[PDB]
Design a protein around this nucleic acid. Structure first.
Ligand SMILES: [Ca+2]
Ligand SMILES: [Ca+2]
Ligand SMILES: [Ca+2]
Ligand SMILES: [Ca+2]
Ligand SMILES: [Ca+2]
Ligand SMILES: [Ca+2]
Ligand SMILES: [Ca+2]
Ligand SMILES: [Ca+2]
Ligand SMILES: [Cl-]
Ligand code: NI
Length: 194
DNA sequence: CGCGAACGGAACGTTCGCATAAGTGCGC
């Protein structure tokens, strides 16, 4: 019954971590190898967790611990951006089961592009059901290795452009409105303002 | 987006950070 779409970067230049975020959002304990710490946020809340892969991805990446360590490996810089976090507002009139399928579908539209998505749904059965989406900033190659982000000043993927940003905003509107109609609600949602 | 910082390899050529719209039923 409300629109909310946030697109942000997870950067090490601000003391952030992919292992910390994945643990904080999934309410699990994940080991960081390069720092030999244990990111233990298992005392947090999380009602649904899933990792969604693109077509040419190995089943290894469905493990949350391996994934973000493999990512940190490629992001071997002190200012390296490790991931992209997308949080979305879920309609609070939805039951958990239908709220999952809604968030699951939009996440699969991202893995079709094709990123790896760490989907975690927070506080269902509450006033503000939302879903965090940790997405990789690189794609996979023929050898299941991360491709580079950059070639000179140009990008390899179009994931970081305004056109793709505004596309994702409109996509979340359409997907959400579709599920709102399917479950039998007269309520719809919009992305723009003014 | 073009700039300089940050890589790998131990020069300086090359990959990167930077970050979009939108402000609630947010939240330290
Ligand atoms: Ca700061
Ligand atoms: Ca769970
Ligand atoms: Ca409620
Ligand atoms: Ca070095
Ligand atoms: Ca060598
Ligand atoms: Ca010399
Ligand atoms: Ca931009
Ligand atoms: Ca929120
Ligand atoms: Cl939070
Ligand atoms: Ni949350």
């Amino acid at each position: 019954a409300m629109y909310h779409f946030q697109n942000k970067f997870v950067s090490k230049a601000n003391g952030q971590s992919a292992t910390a975020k994945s643990a904080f959002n999934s309410a699990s304990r994940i080991k960081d190898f390069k720092e030999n710490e244990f990111k233990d946020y298992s005392n947090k809340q999380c009602d649904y967790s899933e990792i969604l892969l693109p077509n040419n991805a190995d089943d290894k990446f469905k493990d949350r611990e391996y994934l973000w360590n493999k990512v940190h490996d490629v992001e071997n810089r002190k200012n390296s951006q490790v991931a992209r976090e997308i949080i979305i507002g879920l309609p609070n009139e939805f039951d958990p089961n239908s709220n999952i399928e809604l968030a699951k579908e939009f996440a699969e539209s991202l893995s079709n592009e094709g990123m790896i998505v760490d989907l975690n749904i927070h506080k269902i059965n509450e006033e503000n059901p939302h879903a965090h989406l940790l997405c990789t900033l690189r794609g996979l190659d023929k050898n299941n290795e991360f491709e580079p982000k950059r070639k000179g000043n140009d990008y390899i993927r179009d994931w970081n452009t305004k056109e793709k940003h505004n596309e994702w905003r409109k996509r979340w509107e359409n997907v959400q409105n579709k599920h709102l109609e399917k479950n039998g609600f007269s309520v719809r949602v919009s992305a723009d303002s003014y």
